[PDB]
Amino acid sequence: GNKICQFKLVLLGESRVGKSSLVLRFVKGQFHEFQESTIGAAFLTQTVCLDDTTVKFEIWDTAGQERYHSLAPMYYRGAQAAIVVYDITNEESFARAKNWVKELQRQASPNIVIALSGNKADLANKRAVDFQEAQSYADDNSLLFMETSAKTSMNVNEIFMAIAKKL
Numbered sequence: 001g002n003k004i005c006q007f008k009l010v011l012l013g014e015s016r017v018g019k020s021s022l023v024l025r026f027v028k029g030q031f032h033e034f035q036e037s038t039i040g041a042a043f044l045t046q047t048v049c050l051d052d053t054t055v056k057f058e059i060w061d062t063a064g065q066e067r068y069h070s071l072a073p074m075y076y077r078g079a080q081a082a083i084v085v086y087d088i089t090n091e092e093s094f095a096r097a098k099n100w101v102k103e104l105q106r107q108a109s110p111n112i113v114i115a116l117s118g119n120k121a122d123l124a125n126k127r128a129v130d131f132q133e134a135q136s137y138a139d140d141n142s143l144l145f146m147e148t149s150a151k152t153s154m155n156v157n158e159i160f161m162a163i164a165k166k167l
């Protein structure tokens, strides 16, 4: 196809859940076991092929530490999509993700597409958030949900592509 589309995506979530790793895996195909916490935000882009359409992603990888919370609107205000990420081995990170979802539903564009990533799924031997419970929560709140692993690549390209398909 010769059609070209571009859209803005923002990643939000508690510090250390794997936002930067998810983006690096999708954009550069890399995974770093020692990834430093993000300061403010980082920007990356990736272009993919989706049904006769070339889709370019402009990605804002936000720093998740609470001291950067007041900067979030600068990154999500014009976003067409968001991926709120939690760590499947940390229930508190899942609760934090729900609060990010609430903030997006109240303050971001009313037409924003929101995905929920249950990341670090490769650590299921330390699971703290039940898959079905998270799926039910996502279904009830109209969120595109997938468990992912930046470490193994499981569902990484899939969640980004699923979002592009629903834009």
Ligand SMILES: Nc1nc2c(ncn2[C@@H]2O[C@H](COP(=O)(O)OP(=O)(O)NP(=O)(O)O)[C@@H](O)[C@H]2O)c(=O)[nH]1
Pocket: 013, 014, 015, 016, 017, 018, 019, 020, 021, 022, 032, 033, 034, 035, 036, 037, 038, 039, 062, 063, 064, 065, 119, 120, 121, 122, 123, 148, 149, 150, 151, 152
């Ligand atoms: N086992 C595993 N470790 C992961 C996964 N994704 C990220 N990690 C690890 O988790 C740690 C934090 O990841 P990072 O991407 O920096 O998290 P973040 O959400 O960007 N943190 P911040 O918001 O502070 O910038 C790193 O040690 C990274 O290697 C995953 O899918 N599986």
Ligand SMILES: [Mg+2]
Pocket: 019, 020, 021, 036, 037, 038, 061, 062, 063, 064
């Ligand atoms: Mg980061």
